[PDB]
Symmetry: C3
Subunit: 240 residues, 3 copies
């Protein structure tokens, strides 16, 4: 296995987008590309990462890795790369290696791996009654702001975000028009932990838009396109 | 119904930031002439007095007169959910206060519970000051911050000199009459102030480029920031 | 009486900012030739040497030779009250006087207590080194910062390579000859150094865009930042 990613900035932001939510994950390296699946230690949320082999320059993959990366350690290592370095990931077939370029400085770190083995669930495309596409910056400020009002945001479509706390309560209305796009089939209303929404927004540097997909029968989806390569999907169950 | 609309709502942002590290609560006197606040810090050595005239709002409504008990900690948290460009509107009926932030298709409505904090305002007349100094606000801020790294107290004197003395050594800053610097000085005067409260005061620096210091051995010092077109923030502090 | 006036007073700001975290005190050697400082950290594993020549000052008056014992923690704290554009004057008849001149709008006078600290400087002669690396200061700071999250110690070797090993894994950074990188290698050396002191040394990075590492196996590591027109800051550090 070896994958050379010009524009390692992506790999950097990916790790930044994961490390606050989960401490380790099985990286499932494959011929189709890098795909990751993991839940936070409370099992309220699931993140799925997809970097497809076409978005990497080079890319090669003899066998199927079930790499157990310590996501803390990987993010630490990944902070030693400048935003412009060319990151490469080589892993033979129990420790992963990483390489940063430029072209005058060049750095080789090598990360001890870990024995994580849980298989991946098969997660298919559900049907959502309300689907919202909006600027990701806007969405991050809404979760940041409301989280100084209360612990939980109520999301509604007819789209409105509401939080209720000790000092009072607030709500932000957003209307269809970066653009804001609402796709309803049915009115929908669910409450979520702002704690985890504020983890999810750490992916904001990966895309200017975000997409929210709500239904009463499935977890919320919060997804960031890693353009020309894949996506970061966050799944979040509601509160009861 | 009271309802005030302020297009330049960052003023409100700045006013709460100028109050919150000094006082936790306050009675906002709402009348048809505008908003008037006066409140003292928990240790009774300083008084701050805010004036926002109705004509200085873009829109003013005040059917009945109000005395709003406000948790300034709560109100400041709310007001940080507003962007610096948001148009802010305050509204209340004849028990809670409503705030509205207008971005142009995002619109936020927060609701704050009031409290029973009613204390009739004192009449504070104009006094006569042995020395009166008009300086750039930022310089006043820098001086107080500098000297507080030297000692706990500042000695101010005119003929203007700011002096501090501590375990480290001593220091003093001389400003000369000429933003401009202006010393109406009908009298030499030298007094001593707690830099802790001055440094609270300078949190109103954003509200104006200039600050006016009025001193006299017979009356509290007055630190005054004009809120252009709308009123002032006046901080009164007792010496020794 | 001693009186050195520096129009680029920011040089004093950066110099003190570069010493404060390594040493808390030092004897300053004031003579007609200028300012000479030689101090060791309390662990006695590193030595810092400061040269500021008289011709590098705007005025330099030395009526009598001095050995000022200075509390470097006090003098840093005072120098933070200087603005980076200020003219800074040090003066000593006991006590040390610092004058900050803003031109001139504000004029600041600070006074510091001296202390009894007088060791005699020692003759460090121009040693001969096996490898001399001149590079961007900022890059050297980044390498040391980066590697210090991997391990406690960096292994430097002469191309030139920085290595560090720890609980996470391992890392190598290689800079080839090419601000420029020039490696003047006389025989390959390989010494291990505590990253904790190298990160102290790099606090001087604002004084020069270029740093110079010099290594032999028989002598301490030398890390030199020139102070344009005045002299240098030499950090010296023993291996393991
Ligand atoms: O607004 C708030 O923060 C809550 C209420 C608060 N009260 C005290 O601080 C306080 C409590 C108990 C004894 C005192 C004795 C001396 C000074 C202050 C106090 C306050 O500010 N009063 C106040 C606000 C504005 C003008 C004057 C104020 O007090 C008065 C009232 C009457 C005559 C002297 C002073
Ligand atoms: O040691 C302690 O706790 C007392 C602290 C002290 N005394 C009083 O406030 C006080 C005690 C008893 C009756 C009053 C009647 C009227 C006014 C004040 C008092 C003090 O510093 N005030 C103060 C400090 C700074 C700016 C103004 C101040 O007063 C005010 C407050 C409001 C409007 C006019 C003046
Ligand atoms: O002895 C005399 O009658 C006159 C001189 C004396 N001044 C002070 O005590 C004094 C000096 C310096 C700073 C302070 C800070 C806080 C409180 C008092 C002082 C006095 O009583 N003032 C006075 C008399 C009657 C009504 C209020 C008074 O104070 C004021 C006036 C304005 C606003 C706050 C308080
Ligand atoms: O200036 C300050 O910060 C305090 C004074 C300080 N002394 C020590 O560190 C220190 C104290 C006690 C035993 C030691 C034993 C070994 C190494 C250091 C010390 C200092 O810098 N000495 C110094 C400054 C410059 C050139 C040499 C220095 O030491 C000497 C002196 C003579 C021969 C070897 C070394
Ligand atoms: O205490 C421990 O075990 C380590 C302390 C150690 N030794 C001495 O300073 C020492 C011990 C006994 C006699 C001396 C005679 C002359 C000079 C030094 C010594 C050390 O590391 N110095 C050092 C580390 C880094 C850069 C320079 C160093 O020395 C200096 C200091 C001043 C000028 C020249 C070189
Ligand atoms: O390897 C052999 O056997 C011969 C060479 C040997 N080197 C060291 O001790 C040594 C190696 C590496 C770092 C240090 C750091 C601090 C102190 C000593 C060392 C030696 O005697 N030097 C020496 C002889 C006489 C006076 C001082 C000496 O050190 C120096 C020399 C220059 C400036 C500081 C100290
Ligand atoms: Cl975990
Ligand atoms: Cl996709
Ligand atoms: Cl209070
Ligand atoms: Cl006014
Ligand atoms: Cl020390
Ligand atoms: Cl030199």
């Amino acid at each position: 296995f070896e994958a050379r990613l010009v524009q390692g900035s992506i790999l950097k932001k990916v790790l930044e987008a994961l490390k606050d939510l989960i401490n380790e994950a099985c990286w499932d390296i494959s011929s189709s590309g890098v795909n990751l699946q993991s839940m936070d230690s409370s099992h309220v949320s699931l993140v799925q990462l997809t970097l497809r082999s076409e978005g990497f320059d080079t890319y090669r993959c003899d066998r199927n890795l079930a790499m157990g990366v310590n996501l803390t350690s990987m993010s630490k290592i990944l902070k030693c790369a400048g935003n412009e370095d060319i990151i490469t990931l080589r892993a033979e077939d129990d420790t992963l290696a990483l390489v940063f370029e430029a072209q005058e400085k060049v750095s080789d770190y090598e990360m001890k791996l870990m024995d994580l083995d849980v298989e991946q669930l098969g997660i298919p495309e559900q049907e959502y009654s309300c689907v919202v596409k909006m600027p990701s910056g806007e969405f991050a400020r809404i979760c940041r702001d409301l989280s100084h009002i209360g612990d939980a945001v109520v999301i509604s479509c007819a789209v409105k975000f509401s939080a209720s706390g000790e000092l009072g309560n607030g709500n932000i209305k957003l209307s269809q028009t970066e653009a804001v796009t609402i796709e309803m089939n049915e009115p929908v209303q669910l409450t979520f932990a702002l704690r985890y929404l504020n983890f999810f927004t750490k992916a904001t540097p990966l895309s200017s838009t975000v997409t929210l997909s709500m239904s009463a029968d499935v977890p919320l989806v919060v997804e960031y396109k890693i353009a020309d390569m894949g996506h970061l999907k966050y799944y979040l169950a509601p509160k009861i």
